[PDB]
Each structure stands twice: as C-alpha cells, then as structure tokens.
C-alpha cells in the first residue's frame, strides 16, 4: 500500500458545466498538498473503453470522491450514476463521498443523501477549503 | 489520559441561528484558557460521515457539553437529539451538560431538564463567563 | 390525519437474513388491521427498480416504521444506513418508529434508548404481539 | 379536586430489577380501588416512544407517586434521576409521593426523612398494605 | 404515454446459448398481455441485415428491456456490450430494464444493484413469473 | 512479439476530404514517438488487392485504430465499414478503437458508438494530442 | 413631497438566494398600494446593463428601501456592500430604510439597532405584514 | 438618435456551432420589430469578402450587439477575439451589448458581470424572450 | 515459565449475544495492563479443529477464565460446558474461574457455583474493573 | 519436504456459481502471502484424466482445503464428494479442512460438519481474512 | 416422551476391534427390554450406504447412546470423531449417553468426568449389568 | 416436617478411598431405620449423568448429611469442595450435617468445631454407633 | 507565498495625462520601500496581448491598486473599466483599492465609490504619502 | 525544439520606405541579444518562389512578428496581407504580433488592430527598445 492503496486520492464528480469549478478545486487540491492525485475524466479516463467502465474505474480506484452538487449535476445521468454508486460508501475506503452543494447555493440537497454529512457553504466561499481538509482526514486514515 | 481523557474539552450544542453566540463563546473559551479544545460542527465534524454518527462522536469524545437554549435550538431536531442524549450524563465524565438559557432570556427551560442546574442570565451578561468556570471545574475534575 | 392517506401504512426495515420473521410479523398486521398495506422490499420493490431508493422512499411514504434489528442486520451496511436514515426521517416517530429486538440482548441496540425505546424481553412471540398492539395504537393516535 | 381528573391516578418509579414487586403492588391498588389507573413503564411506555420522557411525564400527570427504592435501584442512574426529579416535581407530595423501602435498612434511603417519611420496617408484606392504605388516604384527601 | 406507441413493446437481450429460455419467457409475455410484441434477435433480425445494430435499435425502440444474464452470456463480448449499452440507453429504466439472473448466484451480476435490482432467488420458474408481473406493472405505469 | 505483436501500431480511418487532418495526425504520431507506424491507405495498402481485403488487413494488422468522425466519414461507405467492424473491438488487442469527433465539432456522435468513450474537442484544439496519449496507453499495454 | 415623484417608489435589496421571498413581498406592496412601482434587480436590471450600478442607483432613486438580510445574504459581498451603501445613502431613512430579518435571530443583524430597528420576531408571515404596513406609513409620512 | 440610422440595427456575435440558435433568435427580433435589420455573418458576409473584418465592422455599424457565448464559442479564438473586441467597441453598451448564456452555468461567462450583466437562468426559451424584450428596450432608449 | 506458564492469561466464556460486553472487557484487560493476552474464540480459536477441542484448549492453555453469566450464557450449551469444566478449578492454576453476573443483574447465580466467590455488581458499573484486579492477583501468583 | 510436503498449500472446494468468490479468495491468498499455491480446477487440474481422479489429486496433494458452503455447493455432487472426503481429515496433514459459510450467510451448516469448527461471518466481511490466517497456522505447522 | 417414538432406541458407538463386546452387550439390552431396537454399524449400516453418515444419524435418531471406549477405539480417528460428535449431539445426555470403560483404567477416558460419568471399575461383567440397568433407567425416565 | 418428604433421607459425602466404610455405615442406617433411603454416589449416581452435580443436588435434597473425612478425602479437591459446599448448604445443619472423623486425630478436621462438632474419639466402631444414634435423633427432631 | 502572493504589490490606475503624477507616486513607492513593485502599463504590460487582458492581469496579479481620480481618469474608458472592476475588491486580497482624488482637488468623488474610504488631500500635499502607508498596511496584512 | 521551435525568432513586417527603420531595429535585436534571428525579405526570402509563399513562410516559421505601422505600410498590399494574417495570432506561438506605430507618430492605429496592445512612442524614442523586450518575453515563453 504505502500511502497509495488506491491509485487515485480523490475524484471530482461533476458535469460539463461544472468543469471550471472542478478544475479550480482539483488545482487547489493537487497544488496545495503537492503529491495528491485527483481523477478528472478529461485526462485520467481513456478513450475506447466504455463510459460506464471508465466511471467504475473512477469510482473504485480512488481513495475519496467529491460530489459537486449543481443543477447541471442533477440534470446529467452520469452524475446520477456516480451519486447513486457513492451512496453506501461515504465514510468507506472504496471512495469516501464528500458532497459540496455549490450550484444550489447550499439550499437543496438530494433526498437520499440527507442523512450523510456534507460540505456546507459555496466552493469559493470555503467549500473547496473544507473539501481538502475532509479528504485529507480520509487520506491520513487510509495511508 | 494526561488532561485529555476525551479528545475534546467542550462541545457547544447550538442551531444555525445560534452560530454567532456559539462562536463568541468558543473564542472566549479557547482563547481565555489557551489549551482548551471545543467541538464545533463546521470545523471539528467530517463530511461523508452520517450526521447522527458525527453528533455521536461530538457527544461521546468531549469532556463537557454546552446547550445553548434558544428558540432555534428548540426548533432544530439535531439540537433535540443532543439535548435528549445529554440528559442523564449532566455531571458525568461522558460529556458534562451545561445549559445556557440565552435565547429564551433565562425564562422558559425545557420540562425534562428542570431538575438539573443551569447557567442563569444571558450569555454576554455573564452566561459565557459562568459556562467557562463551570466547564473548568469539570476539566480539573477529569484531568 | 388518517390511518391510510399515504401509499403505505406500515414499512418494515429488515435484512435479507430477516425475511421470514418480517413477513410473519407483517402477515399479523396486514391481516388483523382493516385496510392496512405494508411495505416489504422483498415483494414491494420490483426488479429493474432502485431497491435502496424505494426502501428510502418507503420510510417517509409510510404511516409507520418498524425497524427489525438482528445480529445479521448489524453485519449489513446498506440496511444499517436505512435504519440510521429512518431515525433522521422520524426523530419524533410519526406514529410508529419501533426498533424490534425481542429475544435479543440490549447491547445489540444502538444508544437511542432514551427517546426511542425498543421492543425488549427474551420472548420473541410476545415481541410480535407488542409490535402489533403498538402499530394499532400508533395508527389510532396518528389518525 | 378528583381521584381521576388526570390521565393516571398512580405512578410507580422503580428499576428493571424491581418489575415483579412493582407489578404485584400495582395489582393490589388497581384491583382494590375503583376507577384506579396506574402508570408502569413496563406496560404504559410503548416501544418507539421516549421511555425516560414518558416516565418523567407520568410523575406530573399522575395523582400519586410511589417511589420504590431497592439496592438495585440505587445502582441505576436514570432511575435515580427520575426519583430525584420526582422530589422536584412534588416537594409537598401532591397526595402520594411515597418512598418505599420496606424490608430494607434506613441507610439505603436518601436524607429526605424529615419532610418525606418512607415506608419503614422489616416486613415486606406489611409495607405493601401500608402503601395501599396510604394511596387510598391520599386519593381521598386529594379529591 | 402508451403500452404500444413504439414498434416493439418488450425486447430481451440474451445470448445464443440462452435462446430456449428467452423464447419460453417471451411466449408467456406475448401470449398473456394483449397487443404485446417482443423483439427477439433470433426471429426479428432478418438475414442480410445488421443483427448487432438491429438489437441496438431494439433497446431504444422498445417500451421494455429484459436483460437475461447467464454464465454463457458473460462469455460473449458483443452480448455484454449490448447489455452495457442498454444501461446507457435506460439508466432510469423507462418502464422495464430488468436484469434476470433467477436460479443463479449474485456474484455473476455486475455491481449496478443499488439503482437496478435484478430478479433474485434460486427458483427459475418463480423468476419468469416475477418478470411477467414486472413487465405488466411497467407497461401499466408507463402508459 | 517484442513491441510489434501487430505489424501496425495505429490506423487512421478517414475519407478523402479528411486526408489533410489524417496526415497531420499521422505526422504528429509517427514524428513525436519516433518508432510508431500508422497505416495510411495511400502508402500502406497495395494495389491489385480487393479494397475490402486491404481494409480487412488495415483493421486486423494494427494494434490501434482511430475514427476521424466528419461528415465525409459519415458519407463514405468504406468509413462505415471500418466503423462497423471496429465496434466490438474498441478496448481490445485486435485494433483498439479511438473516435475523434473533429468534423462534427464534438456535437453529433453515431448512435451505436454512444456507449464507447471518445476523444472530445477538435483535433488541432487537443484531439490529436489526446489520440496520441490514448493510443500510447494501448501500445504500452500490448507491448 | 410625493409617494411617486421619483422613478421608483420602493426598492428591495436582497440576494440571489432571496428572490422568491423578495418577489412575494413586492407582490403584496405593488398590488395593495395604488401607483406603487418597486425596483427588483431580478426584473428591473436589463442584461447588457450594469446590474450593481443600477441597484446602487435604485437605492437613491427610490422613495423607500427594504433591506432583506438572510444567512445567504451574509455570504455575498456585493449584496452586503449594497446594504452597507444603503445605510450611507439614507442614515435618516428617507421614509423606508427597513432591515428585514423576521423569522431569524438578532445575532445575524449588524449593530445598527439603536437608530435603525429591524423587523423582529419568529413569524415570517407577520414580518411581511409589518413591512407592508411600514411601507404605507413611510409613503404617507413622506408625501 | 434613431432605431435605424445606421446600416444594421442588431448584430449577433456567435460561433459556427451556434448558427441555428443565433438564426432562430434573429428571426424573432427581425420579424417582431418594425424595420429591424440584423447582421449575421452566416448570410451578411459575402464570399470573397473579409468575414472577420466584416464582423468587426458589424459591431460598430450596428445599433445593438448580442454576444452569444456557448462552450463551443469558448473553443474558437477568432470568435472570442470578436467578443473581446465588442467589449472594447462598446463598454457603455450603446443600447444593446448583451452577453447571452441562458441555459448555461455562470462559470462559463468572463468576469465582466458588474458593469455588463449576462442573460442568466436555466431556461433557454426564457432567455430568447428576455433578449427580445431587452433589444426593444435598448432600441427605444437609444432612439 | 517466565510470566507465561500458560499461553493465555485470561479467557472470557460468553455467548454470541454477550460478545459486545466480552469485547469491551477484553479491550479493557488487554489495553490497561499492556502485555496481557485474553482468549477470544473469534481470533484465538482455529477452524477445522473440533469445537470441543478448541474449547478444551481455551480451558487448559489459559492462566485465568471469566464466566459472563447472562441468560444467553445460561441458554448456550458451550457456555454450560465451560462452566461445568471450570467448576473445580476456580482458585487453581489450570484456569482460575471468575464469575461476573452482568446479564442477571447480580441476582440469579447458578446453584452449583454458589459456594465459589464471584464478581458482584454489573460489568460497566464496576464488574470489569473487579475482574481485572481479581485476574491480576492470580497472574502475579502464577508468574 | 522443506515447506512443500504437499504440492499445493490450499484447495478451494466450490461450485461453478462460486467461482467469483473462490477466485477472489485465491487471489487474496496467493497475492498476500506471495509463495502460496492454491489448487483451482480450471488451471491446476488436467483434461483427459477422470474427474474423480483429478478431485482425489486435489484432495490428497494439498496441505489445506477450504469448503465454500453455498446453495450451489450444496446442490453440486462434486462439492458433496469433496465435503464427504474432507470430513475426517479436518485438522490433519492430508488437507486440513476449513469451512466458510458465505452463501448461507453463516446460518445453515451441514449436519455432519457441525462438531468441526468453521470460519464464521461472510467471505468479504472477514471470512477470507480468517481463512488465510487459519490456513497459515496449518502451513506453519506442516512446514 | 416415549421409549420407542424414534427409529432406534439404543445406539452403540464402538470400534471394529470392539464388535464382539458391543454385540454381546446389545444382545442383553435387545433381548431383556420389550420393543427395544439398537443401532449397530456392523448390521444396521447396509453396504453401498454411507456408514460414517449413518452412524452420525444413529446418534441423534436413537433414544440412547452408549459409547464403548477401548485402547483400540483410541487408535481409530473416525470412531473418536463419532464419539466426540456424540458429546456435541447430547451434552445433557438425552437419557443415555454412557461412556463405557469397565475393566479399564481412568487415564484412558477423556476429561468429561464431571458432567458425564463413565462406567467404572475393574469388572467387565459388572459393567454390562450396570449399562443394562442404566439403559432401563434412562428409557423409563425419558418416556 | 417429615423423615421422608424429600427424595433422599440421608446422604454420605465421602472419597473413592472411603467406599467400604461409607457403604457399611449406610447399611446400618438404611437397615435399622424404617423407610430410610440414603444417597451414595457409588450406586445412586448413574453413568452418563453428572456425578459431581448429582452429589451437589443430594446434599440439599437429603434430610440428613454425613460428611466422612479421612486423610484420603483430604487429598481429593472435588470431594473437599463438596464437603465445603455442604457447609454452605446447611450452616444450621438441617437435622444431620455430621463430620465423621472417628479413629482419627483432631488436627485433620477443618476449624468449624465451635458450631459443628465432629464425631470424636479413637474408636471407629463407636463412631458408627454414634452416627447411627445421631441420624435417628436428627430425623426424629426434624419430623 | 513569502511576501509575494501576488506578482505585483500595487497598480496605479491612471490616464495618459496623469502619467507624471503616477510616475512620481510610483518612484516614491518603489524607492522609499525598496523592494515594492508597482504595475505601470508602459513597462509592466506586454504588446501583442489584448488591452482588456493586460488590464485583467494588472487588476488580478497585484496585491493593491490605486485609483488616481482626475478629469482625465473620468474621461478615459480604460480607467472606468479599472474603477468598475475594483469596486467590490476594495479591502480585499485581489487588489485592495485606494482612491486618491488629486485631479478633482478632493472635491468630486464618483457616486458608486462614495461608501468606500479614500485618500483625502492632493497627491503632493500628502496624498502620495497616505497612499504609501495605506498600501503598506495591506502589504503587511497579505505578506 | 531547444530554443528554436520556429526557425526564426522575429520578422519585421515593413515597406520598402521603412527598410532603414527595419534594418536599425533588426541590427539592434540581432546584435543586442547575440543569438536572435530576424527574418528580413532581402536576405531570408528566396527568389523563384512565389511572393505569397515566401510571406507565408515568414509568417509561419517565426516565433514573433513586428508590424512597423507607417503610411508606406498602410499603402503597400504585402504589408496589409501580413497585418491581416497576423491579426488572430497576436499573443500566440505561430508568430506573436507586435505593432510599432513609428510612421504615424503613435497617433493613427488600424481599426481592426485596436483591441490588441501595441508598442507606444516612436522607434528611436523607445519603440525599438520596447519591441526587443516584448519579443524577448515571448522568446523566453516559447523556448
């Protein structure tokens, strides 16, 4: 194992609209902590594979996972698939699940996710900062 | 053990409305006594865990616990859960329970809590000061 | 309100190890009580559908929750999450929110005893009778 | 006022070690005295409900309190808190507020002797008869 | 919408090892249910035509998908790709999107259990009856 | 085998209109990685053979294959033949299949290909760069 | 002077989280009061235009200011700057300069209480009625 | 001045991916508003001519600019330069200088929000109606 | 010998229901005294051996042995076998026998065991603490 | 001998349905301990031999043997043959016999096997981990 | 219950060295006692059948077990396993569960003496008479 | 009460070295005294049964205890435990609880002399006569 | 970070007319404090970039920013763009905004800027000196 | 690449009249920085090629490009062709575009070029010096 039991340390689950926020969060995570690796579908997924298989890999080969909850995320079925699969694994070692409610401005929260604790506030206003610390506690735990 | 039998020294049980009062009390406690640690859900709880589990941790890993009794606290079910679980542990070592009746202006007091002694007056008017001394007696006791 | 304004009148949260016990208990409720319709994820969750989501919906769309907790239940995380979620759904119980552990030690039950008493004793048959009477009392009081 | 204007006419505060003794004593009261309805947390506190809160409510919503104190009772903190609370509820007794320690040493009883005499002597059977007569005297005087 | 607005009302995704089982299951559906027309690539895909493309079209041009998964199915890549594609076609199921593995171990089924429950149990005959009822429920709900 | 299990490392599947883009991609692939060989029909196919046989050779003697999806590619039946034959071989060793949606400007994607992951963006804007890395992962895998 | 000599008669300073509440409140004012025209930056600030500048202009070009302060408002700096600026625009209030925090704790409100009382209490519906009466009183007194 | 003193009354800056959306929007403007003539580089830039230069001229020789910004637009440098240039042409807007991103996330829009508000919301149809009303308001105010 | 004449220092004899209490006692024993080893059947017994042989090993290879007397322990025949075999060895070196009457709440005591002294009170209320000291006297004796 | 008195170190006795669980267990055993060899019938048995002879070889040339008890295992006569032959050899050197009750969820246990100790819990939930340690004790013993 | 409700009334567990002694003992029981039917694996286990399984079944399907233990018996593992299993079958004896070692030293007997006394003494003939009387006492008490 | 209301009228606690002496003494009692039935573990404890438990039961289920203490008895721990237990069973003697050490030094007898006199002197024959008379006196007084 | 979180420490926002005053201020700032870097467009901006992009860089890569408010500054749209973009960032870390009213001789102040505090007096008469100290407080804050 | 990704480092775009200024600038660039290569048409272009092709080479094989804007440059169509082709490539790697307005004395600037930043002042008066530094930033960037 030696710090990388999983290949990836975090995966940001996000729609095409949410790419700007996701990239800013990933740059913040990867840059601040130096040795962290986030999964982003543009660079870390591989063409020719099935989309579901690449998502299963993103789901299963990462220590932690972040849900950027936005109306684009609510609209997109790939985001729904990631949200549904990350439901029972939230404090787990198979991808700990961190919801960040940036696009709904910390108001609406999916009804199934309710009992699981989430990153409150908006991403730039403290959410990204909270996500990094929350992920870091799991990364230390799973090291 | 060595002064920290419990990870936390105090936990302020309070609603979203009560955050300003809770933060002022926590800053007063943490700053005045230097080495004290309060549990506050924004920083000391971890996303991805269940909310009840994070509350159980806050309840069980703290030497003392403060109930900020306010109409927001009366409204909020998480505050009710903390109040109900802290009922039989009030002078105990599993989180000594200090009620401070700031938001009801020391008038109304929950009917179950009645037989347990509480911090009288309002928080800025002496309640925070009383909470610090009351918690400090328990911290010395449990050191 | 009513005994049967919602889609379901009772719902039993239970493990795949608990199916026989839950079905026998439901047969008493659903036969004895006029117009009663219970949710059981064995029969009421159709293939193709989202069984976890449907059980999550059943907790809030029922007039009564019964939570059957067994040592097999305590080994299944998704079932435990549904039970933990049911506590978040109904902290005031909303009629029934009955933990059932009759014929089983107190140590098995989570520490929610104060505000949510469980079906206690070493008699399993008496536990079913107690739940059946409790369900009738809760439906009568709720209506 | 009345023997039976409130929901309950008698309530017995007692341990889970004391259930047989309390139920036998209640059977004498509830059979002998016309219209009498006693609270026992064994039967009157429904599963799902808040048993500690219901017992707390029973002390004030009863016309009479009997407090059964045994060496098993003195080892249970929540029961002791309910008895201590019962003293806060009824310092003038409000008809019955009877500590029962018949067949047991005086040293066991808390030092409230002056203003709240307990059922004394080495006879257990005579103690039940004394409580039964006392309950009738208190209901007659209260009405 | 309708039970039969589209060209096909049901389609069964299955292997060339599964033809007897799929045809027997379809015979129950297509005989029992009024106006029902199922796609089977055995009969509905004409020679000269593109059988893989026609089966791909059948998944979206059907009102219901049944996915028959067997150990023979799990050895055929084009069939597995059609099943994997069917999940991409209908993540919300669109009435039926039923994985059928009745009389077969859970380990065989891909990890889509949470949001897409499969026909479970050790009874093959009961599985066909469950699919038949499920197809009727899905057509009724869809219409 | 020794790095060349297949004679060719990549084959660009493209129409006569798409030759400029295909040649730029091939020059980029062959030049950047030094020892790579792409199949291009002008130089790597041999006159006197049947066109289908030369395409079968291009399909079967290459480690990877790239689909340049353009309206010329959609129009041309030879491109359709290559696309249809490369459908079930997409992550495989018989010519891994990489779609690049340059001519439709990453908008329209053939309906059958949908479930397979593709190179997003336009060729000069990052698509060629993505194709090289995606092919290189397969070339390392199949070395 | 007049109720309507200026371009706008009321203006509501509020967050993008507060749009529903502000619009509902404005609908009461603008329907009830003859000739009333309110500024809302949702509708009155045209695209292409300077929305912050237009809202800044609306504070001085209105006969009445209502300042809707919510925990979402307190997380938005430009909105807070507009509210802070509104205090600079109208320290004597000029008819309405009403902070609205009805159904919300006093701790949320900035310390301008002495010379600028806010709409207080735990009733949201009563707050709208109080603002509506206050707006009528201010327009009547101003005219 | 006038609604139509210049050669063009509206001009829409948009990508070759955006042609359908821009033409549909223009059809509403050019049909609804009397004497209106819009510049679209699809039709108004003649072959042989300098299309980039003609679009550059159209920004200053129009009474109104609408800037349609899409994720496809954000991938085209010459289009982005024309939009960036349009900001240099009309910082005070000169009637319309409307960024249109309706049905698209805020993160996509360049940080000119304060002094140049964009057409916001998740409704595309409502965005066209908002632009149409805005164009009429700008032409009326400009004249 | 050198402190470990026997391989194990203590063995907790307990039923499946009693595992929570047994584990808490074992964690308390092993953690408090640092170098102690308790036998627990889950980890210290080995599959493939006969259950009686593994129990004989647990009985014979431990310095001391604890009987957790509970109704589950009274029900279970393996617990009866351990109790019967530990009868004549109670102050001995072949597994000194410590009864702790937690589950009967120090009331009922098996009739054969009567003449042997036992740990009084309940486990959390002092019984575990007493067991540790009693075992420690034997461990010092047999060192 | 020198660590390999027997050719194989373990043999997983399992049905065709149980192959996924068996392979995961074998990968866990072979990978974790590095030099271990498990017998699996797909790779370690040789075609052309009689099935009984290959099973006799698997039974007799392995240090240890694991029974995966599942309904598929109960159904299959080859599994019955292995179970029957491994009955009297359970702690022995001719293939020590480890039962793991994964498919019956640790409930039902074959009536003959009863007196032999088994791996409790389910395979992923701790059973595989227990099997590895139990086998390792025998491998150390027989080294 | 009965002396003869089950298939067998007595069963003798014994070695292939013990056949003469067991048959002579059975002849006394089966001749003396009316309706008595004993299991002996010499005669009652038919060829082709599973002799070990049939003897295992005989222990539970008998009203009485006699366990004949000899130095020859102590050299046979399958016989010892059946005797060890018989202890697991009947720890409370269920009428007869008689170890017979008459005319043989105590050291030979396994250490189950306390709760399961063996036929003792140096007389073999007296041992048979003692077993015969014991079998009659056990059948009489059991009935 | 009676000489013979219980199952046994006398019981003799004695060693396996003491069988001849105990049987001879019992023969005098059981022959001389009408209806007398003595417990001797030599004859009254049936094989298969729990001999230690039966002797323990015999002490309380007898009308009289005789405790035969010899230097052989003083070397047997289970016998000494039964004698020590007999003192716990009958401290007031309940008729007979006679230590017999006639023909043996006082130093052999445990120090219970004051409240439990033993059969003293150097005559063994006179001791049996003294016990016989004592048993008759105790049965006569007890009845 | 280490004193330079931003590349520049200050940026003087000024028109072509104001260059003499801006250069004197910059020389005073850079020379007095030694290690400070101001952004001036003549030297610190780069030709070939768009003017807006160079201004965005000047706005975003500087710790602080100075507005030289002059009639030339009021006339120039680039100065308006800088003023408008620096409005909500005035005490912030993204370029703290210091207005110096030199050219209007501290009389006229832009209407939007009013609520933000400014450097009073004229530049040579104390304004430059005040700007240096005000910027230095922010530079110390952001170090 | 290694500092020369492009063959040329700069290209001065200038008319026949502007040759003296261009040569002085080129001598200054080439001489000052030592290893720089500028494209000048007299020496770096090759006769026999088409003039447009030689200009395309000058445009495409140079890291940076300088526009000497003069009335001769405005008159000459070759200069217009270079200016038009260098429009969208101004901060790019395909020839970064630096305008120097020497011949118009920094007054007139082509209307299309307006939004791109330029070298201000006259060439001898600082323009050449500015061009060298601006080009050097790009050369360092593209090294």
Coordinates of C-alpha atoms in Angstrom, one line a residue, chain A residues 111-117, chain B residues 50-53 55 77-78 81, chain C residues 56 59-60 65 67 80-93 97 112 115-116:
Chain A
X111 CA -33.4 13.4 -0.6
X112 CA -31.4 10.1 -0.4
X113 CA -28.2 11.9 0.6
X114 CA -29.8 13.8 3.5
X115 CA -28.6 11.6 6.4
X116 CA -24.9 11.9 5.2
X117 CA -23.0 15.0 6.3
Chain B
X50 CA -23.6 10.3 8.7
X51 CA -24.9 13.4 10.6
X52 CA -26.0 11.2 13.6
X53 CA -22.5 9.5 13.7
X55 CA -23.2 14.0 16.5
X77 CA -34.2 18.3 15.7
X78 CA -30.4 17.9 15.9
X81 CA -31.2 14.8 19.8
Chain C
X56 CA -35.7 5.0 1.5
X59 CA -39.8 5.1 5.3
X60 CA -41.3 8.6 4.6
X65 CA -41.9 2.3 10.6
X67 CA -37.1 -1.4 12.4
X80 CA -27.9 -0.2 8.8
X81 CA -27.8 3.0 6.7
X82 CA -31.5 2.7 6.0
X83 CA -32.2 2.2 9.8
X84 CA -29.9 5.2 10.6
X85 CA -31.7 7.2 7.9
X86 CA -35.1 6.2 9.4
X87 CA -34.1 7.9 12.6
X88 CA -33.3 11.0 10.6
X89 CA -36.7 10.7 8.8
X90 CA -38.7 10.4 12.0
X91 CA -37.0 11.5 15.3
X92 CA -40.5 12.2 16.8
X93 CA -41.5 8.8 15.4
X97 CA -40.8 4.1 14.6
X112 CA -31.1 5.8 21.2
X115 CA -36.1 8.9 23.2
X116 CA -36.8 5.7 21.2

